[PDB]
Amino acid sequence: MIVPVRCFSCGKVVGDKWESYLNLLQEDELDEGTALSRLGLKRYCCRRMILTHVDLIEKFLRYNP
Amino acid sequence: EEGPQVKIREASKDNVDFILSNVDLAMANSLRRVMIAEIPTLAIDSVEVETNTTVLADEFIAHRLGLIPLQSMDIEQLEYSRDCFCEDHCDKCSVVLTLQAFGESESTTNVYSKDLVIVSNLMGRNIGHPIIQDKEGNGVLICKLRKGQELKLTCVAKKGIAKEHAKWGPAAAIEFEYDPWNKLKHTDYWYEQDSAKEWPQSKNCEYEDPPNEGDPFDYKAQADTFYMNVESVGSIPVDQVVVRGIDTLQKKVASILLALTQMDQD
Amino acid sequence: ANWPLPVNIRRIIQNAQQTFHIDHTKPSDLTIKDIVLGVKDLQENLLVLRGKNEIIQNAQRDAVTLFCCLLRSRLATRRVLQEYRLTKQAFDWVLSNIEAQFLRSVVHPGEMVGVLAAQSIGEPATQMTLNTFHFAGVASKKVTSGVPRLKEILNVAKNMKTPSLTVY
Amino acid sequence: EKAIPKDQRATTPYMTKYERARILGTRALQISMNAPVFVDLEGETDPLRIAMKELAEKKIPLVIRRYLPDGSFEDWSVEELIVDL
Amino acid sequence: ASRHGQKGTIGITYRREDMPFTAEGIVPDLIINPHAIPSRMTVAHLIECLLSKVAALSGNEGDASPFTDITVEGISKLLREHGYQSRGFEVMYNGHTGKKLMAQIFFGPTYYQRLRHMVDDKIHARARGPMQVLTRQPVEGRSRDGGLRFGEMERDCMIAHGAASFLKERLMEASDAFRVHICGICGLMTVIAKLN
Amino acid sequence: SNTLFDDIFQVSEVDPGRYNKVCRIEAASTTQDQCKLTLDINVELFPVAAQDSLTVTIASSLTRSWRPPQAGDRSLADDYDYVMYGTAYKFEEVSKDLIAVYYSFGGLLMRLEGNYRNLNNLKQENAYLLIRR
Amino acid sequence: FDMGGYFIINGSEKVLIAQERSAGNIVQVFKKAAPSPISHVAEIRSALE
Amino acid sequence: EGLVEYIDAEEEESILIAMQPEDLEPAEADVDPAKRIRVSHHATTFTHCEIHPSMILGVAASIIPFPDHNQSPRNTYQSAMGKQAMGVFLTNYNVRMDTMANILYYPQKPLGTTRAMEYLKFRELPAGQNAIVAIACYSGY
Amino acid sequence: TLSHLRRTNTPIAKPRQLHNTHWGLVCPAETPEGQACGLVKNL
Amino acid sequence: YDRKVPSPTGEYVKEPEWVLETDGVNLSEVMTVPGIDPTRIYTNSFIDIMEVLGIEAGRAALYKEVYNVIASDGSYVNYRHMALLVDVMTTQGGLTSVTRHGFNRSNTGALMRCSFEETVEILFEAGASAELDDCRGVSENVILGQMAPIGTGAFDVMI
Amino acid sequence: RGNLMGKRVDFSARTVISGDPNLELDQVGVPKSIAKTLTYPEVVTPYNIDRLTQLVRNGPNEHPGAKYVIRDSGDRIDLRYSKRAGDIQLQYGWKVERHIMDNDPVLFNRQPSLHKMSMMAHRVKVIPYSTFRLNLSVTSPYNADFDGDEMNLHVPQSEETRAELSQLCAVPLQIVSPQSNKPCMGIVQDTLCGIRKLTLRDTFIELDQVLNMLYWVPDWDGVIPTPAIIKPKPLWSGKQILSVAIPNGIHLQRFDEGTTLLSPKDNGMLIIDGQIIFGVVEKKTVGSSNGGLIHVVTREKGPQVCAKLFGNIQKVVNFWLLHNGFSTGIGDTIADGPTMREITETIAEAKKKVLDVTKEAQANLLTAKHGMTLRESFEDNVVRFLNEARDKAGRLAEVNLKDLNNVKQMVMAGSKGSFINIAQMSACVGQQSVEGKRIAFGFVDRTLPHFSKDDYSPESKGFVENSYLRGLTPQEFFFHAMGGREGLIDTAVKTAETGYIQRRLVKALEDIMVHYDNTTRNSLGNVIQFIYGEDGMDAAHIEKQSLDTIGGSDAAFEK
Amino acid sequence: MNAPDRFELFLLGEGESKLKIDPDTKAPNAVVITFEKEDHTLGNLIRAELLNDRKVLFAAYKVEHPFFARFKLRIQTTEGYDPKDALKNACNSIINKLGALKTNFETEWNLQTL
DNA sequence: CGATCCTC
RNA sequence: GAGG
Ligand SMILES: [Zn+2]
Ligand SMILES: [Zn+2]
Ligand SMILES: [Zn+2]
């Protein structure tokens, strides 16, 4: 259920960062901590935003209609 | 010049690091506050959903739409719809965006803020263009679509302030620290053995002389010099978050001065 | 020595020393007659019952026996002078304060004491923790306590779990 | 039959909390129903606050019939009853 | 609720500027009371927090598994390695004044759960409405506009207070109340009242 | 009026009994062999070391809402370094002729013993403490 | 992610709650309380599977 | 292959169980004080070993971070509450016509997990959010 | 759900008690508060 | 046991005394045993006190017992409340329980008894024995929806 | 029972409760929607006509309004429908069912209602949001908690009915309870915690704060007190600004352990004319204590003055604390490397004592004293050494905790937690118990199948050596669960049993009341007591006071 | 459901004014100003500047209840100095400080390169 | 013959 | 059936 736009706590936009994050893990073969920092997610309120996001929309899209 | 003094340590397109010296803590804080809550911005405040065959709910989507940052550069030249003499909204008080998206491919169709389209007449104002900061130029994944999936909606973006809804916040986090040595004794450090060894010192300590143990506590000393870093969400540039922050505060003090004048008649 | 009685006599005294600004360096204007008969007459005015008959008079006498003990112990000649250092002005005020506060302390006819007692016991009973006891370390100090005991008592249990005789 | 004379009255000369509550109730209810007021309302409008003033200035023309368990009773006027509390 | 048997309701909401803030400018999403800790002895809550703070900083998952060798000390080392005081304490400033607090706040992430049963699904009020068929008494339930129960226990409290008339009113004017015709001879409700 | 007591004391011990900015001081007269002093000083505003020689003064001078210093031309009765204000709460006679006075300066306590205190220390809501050098 | 183990009776999901009982064909002796004439008793609750 | 085997309380009576594979049977001959107090092998007459002591627990309790650092009633209460929580109960929720369904908008996998949650599919179907919590006397609301 | 699908009931000397024999078989923590406390179990 | 006793100087002193604690009761026989203080013999079985020493002793022992359960918990209730309950059980002549066997069988109004337990069967024997209801009770006025002689209605208001 | 003793009622509301440091003790925050639902039948007099006509015109959806106007011939006019809804020309004698407005008396209750203090008359205060708000110092009489509890509201419909609530049932009238002849309300939580921290000798405040603190007191005289310090910086103490909340004519004296008029440890308490001389303010001063500020103020100044006191204390304390802060972290459960090492050795010596008594027991040298089994005596002994070790280990812990330790702070103020809590969290949990005895052999001759047959060792029978900080082992974990369960079971038993007890007592004593002859009597007129309480005195007006003739020496009595 | 509109924080209602001057009862030359639709952004800022005024005897502010967007400001001054003028000068001083800051930040930003 | 309060 |  899709990358939340903006970090709840602080407000820093996080909606534009999801796909870039997956590529950094996949292609670039980086660890989550360096990837989060590469995206400029310095505060832990922003790190938890992406690190703990579960993307259920992918599952939801798998349904036939 | 005279009163408050600024020293910009570092500056970027989306971040200013500066030292605000020769100030009152009331002022520095009231400025910090007004930057968070009261600088006017333009954000989607109305969505009319024509078609939604997505897996996401109407309001779920409309909620995220309000969170998409939109150009707010020439915002003071756009009215609050509440003051506009129009019936509802117009080009003098609102921006109208359009979102039409269809799952053409078998592969997942992604919906971005780039896909929002200004329909309104901007009358040559730098306003309403979705803020795009990602390297791929997409900026903000609004939604995802399958094959037969469709999404057709219309957005009325309006002027507002964070104090009414966080979506209208031009800034994210504002770093704020005064007296990195606790020379003022404004905090009492919790410890086990040695507070000094137990508490990490601020980068700001470099900028100040250490307390010097063989000196009595400066009782008379007051907090003046404030290490700040203001982050912009994008809608307004960093220089503008602080300049408009100052100007808004300055403006709301002037309204009190003017209120005193108005009640001084009959 | 410490017992629940109406009229906090100690406070009335501290109140008198503030109100009258008593200085522990000036000799009082009281007499033995003033203090002694003073307290004595106060006792005849601490009414609870009013019937002019012998039964009611003795009923009244008995009702205030304990309070008068406290009053006499507190308002003794040596104490009213060497301890409180009261003046005639401050002394008479204390006499009028006790009388009024005593009459304020009395129960009001209509007070539904039945429900009051039932609730006053029944509520703290709900607050009871550990159905067993705190003497749990010793296996000879095991006696029915708490809610089971209270149940034993109220039901007037013929066969109580821990019958025990204490011999002096 | 039954009664008790004005003389020889063993019940408290002091008005009870329940006597005060019921007396203030009956009066507040009369005031609220356009019954006349026996005192100068200094800007006062609340029926209860008025009944309180009427009590303070002892112009409440009521009589508490105090019953004893035998069935006998003692009559006490609102004016005679001492209102400490 | 936290994941440690610590249920609680929102008392009030403060916007970002009123909230206490960190020097990095981090603000809590939630503020729980210190007093909710001593009596409860739910130490794992405190540990979860510390671990979760380190997890988010390092971009690694926290091992909150039971019978393990994960120590509070172990975590506190890793947190200090990140430039935070080892025990989750943080220098915080008052949102109203911007003045530092004399006390350092135990801050950091903690898994919280949105529980069902929300004010709006519980709020009821009835100033007269539907009456039960047989008893002629207010109906039962918010989703029927029912009368709240003034049970024998509440009846007791009112006797204790000596509120004779309030008790008469709660049991007559509000709820029930009826007029019946009695025979002065037999004393039964037999009287065939041909009113008017 | 004016002064009610003025003497030079010698600090025996300094004690921070579970405190950071407060200390209980033990001192005695440099002149009178019987004259005692046990007082609470704010060691953050005025620090006190062992064997220090301090001048203690109790007055009642230079009632209504407190107006901020406003030193523009304001002249207060102090060539002193540390000044307090409190209330008298007990007058303990320590047998024969010895008398002790009790002062609380907002909870910072004082006990001064000797003999000649007499018609100078009243049960007064007054008393300003002044300490120099 | 559905795990099954339930039924759908009239379009309604039904769980059969596992029911606890003492096993049969188990020999068990019980010390019997003060008033009873029978000191101890040995029971068996014989069943057929 | 007879490396593992099924035991019921009855057979449990006749066997001696080691709690840890290593920590319950290597050998004998400085320590971490922070680490808890674990007794001694002492008994060595072992017939079995515990797969993992945390398996003494079930679904609800399996969700708790460090119950080994909590009072026992708090683990019972938490077990009751996780059944009042909100989150993705199933992926097909969009398709079911059920009486009352409560779905969390943005569920998050907890930053602190238990190995057993991997089998309970928690990080795939979460029931909560990693809120930045401050423990403080603020407005006192 | 998983939890509901691993539930136990006990109709009607110390049934409510967490017996020793329950180790590894029934969850020690997971029971309802009051009424069916210690009667309703979870595998 | 430790004991507070007046010394020759007048003041109270801790003088520890040897006391015997028992499993079982036979007050009648044990108190007549030589070498004891029959004046101080006690039992938690207040019924035995009621039987051997009389109603008043039973009442006192009953209070001591109720008191001890409240104090055991650390809790304190004012004397008069426990005093009132104890007297209530006591005034009958013997011991009357806080059960349907005790107070509910009392000479009290039929309608006020059925409000507790045995609702129907109390109202049945009320019709059979042809009982008259006083209607001066709380529960009876509660049933009748009238102002009870409780606090506020415990007196009349007249002109 | 369900239709006559009790029933469902009109003019009743319910919802989730929430705390409010800004509400008055005797107020209740009522949601605007609830206020809009519940009504008072007000008769039109010239005294109100103007306000009533206005309210009728405001209608049922705008708040200070009404629904229904009742005229002569009792016909109701529905203000939500009706063509003449905005017409209505009011008349005297007519009734206007107006919305519930500020300061109306209302019954406020928390079930179960085991107290007259569980039902209390509150001053209405109409507020936004959907919760009922209440003053934190009203929590205890109701036994409220803001964890999700709901509470009831009843509206008087008669002038005498609202007179009964205001004059008998009112919250300040309930401050001093006749249950235990002492207050039933007091300064709790953040306020209790902060009031200690505020009243420390070390705690000082300057002009800025002082002035704000002073203004925060509603009663405030408007006079700035002279700072306790007039040296390089004017500085007021916490004691100073809080004494502003204390009215004049208030005297309080205590004396704790080392309290000696010079109170070296700032212990005890002395308040003169309502100004704190010395003594840190905590639970003994400001809680619901028998000789506390609250018992005094109520008796001295009055209930309405005492009720104002809760607010005034709350307003300063809550403010100073909001600016001071106060937390609790995992670091508050940590104790010294040296301390831990010492707790460890304390437990090892208990393990040796338990081993030796065992070795002695096994040699047949252990001889039990009269009345008990050789086994019973051994068991009693073992349990003792182990319980001793937990207390000793925990005392070792409590002593290491600095005055800056947040848990130690909550214990010191008395706002939350006890010794056991510190001990179990920091040092050692201790021995587990099921039915008084330690963990039993549920398996043949063993507690778990990880033990050998016939093992009476601490570890074997439920001794939790570990602190919740260190963490519990699987065995320890299970045994704690076993103990835990038993506690939840009887919690469920107590609540069911005590509730029944309470009902029975109530039924048996219902009709007992003090008559016009001071005689305690039932409905039959039978005498229970000749003078209520054997003294015809009311419990609320009674306090433990020392009889100065009973004690001391004969020589001391003479002097 | 019972929640006010978030605009009610910054927008004046019908029959509602910004400032409401009220003469204080307890003390001479003291006044109590109710600031409608305002918070700690203005309350604290004004109070702190009012304290820099040597002719100001008292200056404090409070937000009686967090639901409502309003604050009360108390001002006491020297005989001859009217509080409205102390608040007048208070405000101007603030405006002057801000304008200087505005200028200085603007002069600094123009030197910065990024 | 009894067995805590609330509504769903 | 769920809530304290
Ligand atoms: Zn963030
Ligand atoms: Zn327009
Ligand atoms: Zn007939």
Report which DSSP code applies to K436.
Answer: T
3-state SS class at K457: coil
- The first and second tokens of residue E56, run together, are 């988010």
Beta bridge partners, K234, equal: K230
Length of chain K: 559
D32 touching C (Cβ < 8 Å): no
Residue with tokens 């800007």: D43
Which residues, 6+ apart, have CB-to-CB distance to K308 below 8 Å?
K24, K25, K218, K219
If we measure between CA atoms, which residue out of B178, B180, B101 comes closest to residue B144?
B101
Structural domain boundaries in chain L: 1-114
Which protein residue lies nearest to nucleotide M2, measured between its Cα and the C1' atom? J117
How many other β-carbons are positioned within 10 Å of the β-carbon of residue K381?
20
Please state, in angstroms and rounded to a whole number, the distance separating the CA atoms of residues C81 and C93. 15
For K278, which of F21, F45, F104 is closest by C-beta distance? Answer: F104
- Residue of E115, E120, E122, E143 to mutate, interface with H, max H Cβ within 10 Å: E115
Through-space separation of residue H83 CA and nucleotide N1 C1' in angstroms: 14
Please state, in angstroms and rounded to a whole number, the distance separating the CA atoms of residues C100 and E91. 57
If we measure between CA atoms, which residue out of E34, B82, J126, A45 comes closest to residue K194?
E34
> Which class would CATH give K189-324?
mainly alpha
CATH label of the domain that carries residue D40: 3.90.940.10
- The first and second tokens of residue K552, run together, are 């001391």
CATH label of the domain that carries residue A32: 1.10.10.60
Beta bridge partners, D36, equal: none
Domain end marker among B151, B166, B181: B166
- K12-19 and K132-134 strand pairing: parallel
3-state SS class at L2: coil
Domain that holds residue E167: 131-196
Contact flag for A and K (3+ C-beta pairs < 8 Å): no
CB of E155 within 8 A of CB of J142? yes
H or E element: which one contains K183? strand K182-183
- K229-231 and K233-237 strand pairing: antiparallel
If we measure between CA atoms, which residue out of K278, K282, K253, K281 comes closest to residue K266?
K278
Please state, in angstroms and rounded to a whole number, the distance separating the CA atoms of residues B191 and E89. 10
Please state, in angstroms and rounded to a whole number, the distance separating the CA atoms of residues E152 and B96. 63
CB of K328 within 8 A of CB of K413? no
Chain M positions with an atom below 7 A of a protein C-beta are: 1-8
Please state, in angstroms and rounded to a whole number, the distance separating the CA atoms of residues K260 and K251. 18
What's the one-letter identity of residue B145? L
Query: Would you say the C-alpha torsion C75, C79, C85, C88 has a positive or negative sign?
Result: positive
C-alpha angle G33/G35/G36, rounded to 5°?
75
CB of H46 within 8 A of CB of H20? no
Compute, in angstroms, the gap from residue K142 CA to the centroid of ligand 1: 41
| CB under 7 Å from strand M | E 124, 140-144, 146, 148-149, 151, 153; I 34-35; J 117-119, 121; K 6, 14, 111-112, 492, 495-496, 499-500, 503
Nearest residue in chain K measured CA to CA from L76: K222
Which residues, 6+ apart, have CB-to-CB distance to K305 below 8 Å?
K247, K297
- The secondary structure of chain G, three-state, reads CCCCCCEEECCEEECCCEECCCCCCCCEEEECCCCCCCCEEEECCCCCC
CB of B158 within 8 A of CB of B93? yes
Residue with tokens 């239709």: K3
Task: Decide which of 3.20.20.70, 3.30.1360.10, 1.20.1070.10, 1.20.140.10 is the CATH code for L1-114.
Answer: 3.30.1360.10
Which residues, 6+ apart, have CB-to-CB distance to J116 below 8 Å?
J100, J104, K504, K507
CB of F11 within 8 A of CB of F54? yes
Count: domains in chain B: 2
- Fold for the domain defined by F1-133: OB fold (Dihydrolipoamide Acetyltransferase, E2P) (2.40.50)
Q: At what angle do helices K303-324 and K207-215 cross, to 10 degrees?
A: 150
Please state, in angstroms and rounded to a whole number, the distance separating the CA atoms of residues K512 and J136. 11
Q: Nearest 5°: phi and psi at E6?
A: -125, 75
Contact flag for F and I (3+ C-beta pairs < 8 Å): no
If we measure between CA atoms, which residue out of D22, D80, D16 comes closest to residue D48?
D22
CATH label of the domain that carries residue E135: 3.90.1800.10
Through-space separation of residue C119 CA and nucleotide M1 C1' in angstroms: 24
Please state, in angstroms and rounded to a whole number, the distance separating the CA atoms of residues K374 and K386. 19
Q: Which residues of I lie inside 8 Å of K (Cβ-Cβ)?
A: 16-21, 23, 28-29, 31, 33-35, 37-38
What's the one-letter identity of residue C136? A
- The secondary structure of chain C, three-state, reads CEEEECCCHHHHHHHHHHHCCCCCCCCCCCCHHHHHHHHHHHHCCCCCCCCCCHHHHHHHHHHCHHHHHHHHHHCCHHHHHHHCCCCHHHHHHHHHHHHHHHHHHECCCCCCHHHHHHHHHHHHHHCCCCCCCCCCCCCCCCCCCHHHHHHHHHHCCCCCCCCCEEEC
Beta bridge partners, F82, equal: F131
List of K residues 113-172 with CB within 7 A of strand N: 145, 147-149
Domain that holds residue D63: 1-85
Which residues on J lie below 8 Å from E161 (Cβ)? 151
Domain that holds residue B132: 41-166
If we measure between CA atoms, which residue out of K80, K263, C80, K351 comes closest to residue F108?
K263
Domain end marker among B150, B166, B182: B166
Through-space separation of residue J146 CA and nucleotide N3 C1' in angstroms: 35
If we measure between CA atoms, which residue out of K224, K233, K242 comes closest to residue L56?
K224
Q: Nearest 5°: phi and psi at L93?
A: -50, -45
Residue with tokens 């337990």: J117
- The first and second tokens of residue J31, run together, are 């108190």
Binding site for Zn(2+), residues of B?
Answer: 84, 86, 90, 93
3-state SS class at K459: coil
- The secondary structure of chain B, three-state, reads CCCCEEEEEEECCCEEEEEEECCCHHHHHHHHHHHHHCCCEEEEEEEEEEEECCCCCHHHHHHHHHCCCECCCCHHHCCCCCCCCCCCCCCCCEEEEEEEEECCCCCCEEEEHHHCEECCCCCCCCCCCECCCCCCCCCCEEEEECCCCEEEEEEEEEEECCCCCHHHCCEEEEEEEECCCCCCCCCCCCCCCCHHHHCCCCHHHHHCCCCCCCCCCCCCCCCCCEEEEEEECCCCCHHHHHHHHHHHHHHHHHHHHHHHHHCCCC
Which residues on E lie below 8 Å from C115 (Cβ)? 156, 159-160
H or E element: which one contains J59? helix J55-72
Q: Solved how?
A: X-ray
Compute, in angstroms, the gap from residue J144 CA to the centroid of ligand 3: 20
Binding site, residues of K?
Answer: 145, 147, 149
Q: Are residues B207 and B130 in the same domain?
A: no
Q: Are residues B11 and B128 in the same domain?
A: no
Please state, in angstroms and rounded to a whole number, the distance separating the CA atoms of residues K336 and K348. 18
Q: Give how far Cα K426 sits from Cα of K418, K419, K470, K473, Å.
A: 13, 11, 8, 16
H91 touching B (Cβ < 8 Å): no
**CB neighbour class for K266 (10 Å; exposed up to 12, middle 13-18, buried from 19):** buried
Structural domain boundaries in chain F: 1-133
Resolution of the experimental model in angstroms, please? 3.0
For I38, which of K441, K447, K489 is closest by C-beta distance? Answer: K489
If we measure between CA atoms, which residue out of K124, K169, K173, K115 comes closest to residue K144?
K115
If we measure between CA atoms, which residue out of J106, J107, J110 comes closest to residue J140?
J110
Count: domains in chain D: 1
Residue with tokens 């006891």: C133
CB of J139 within 8 A of CB of E152? no
Domain end marker among B166, B183, B198: B166
Please state, in angstroms and rounded to a whole number, the distance separating the CA atoms of residues K488 and K485. 5
H58 touching I (Cβ < 8 Å): yes
Compute, in angstroms, the gap from residue F115 CA to the centroid of ligand 3: 99
If we measure between CA atoms, which residue out of K260, K268, C25 comes closest to residue F93?
C25
CB of H113 within 8 A of CB of H126? no
C82 touching F (Cβ < 8 Å): no
Subunit contact L27:F70, Cβ cutoff 8 A: no
Rg (chain I; Cα; Å): 10
Please state, in angstroms and rounded to a whole number, the distance separating the CA atoms of residues B121 and B99. 17
Length of chain J: 159
CB of K134 within 8 A of CB of K19? yes
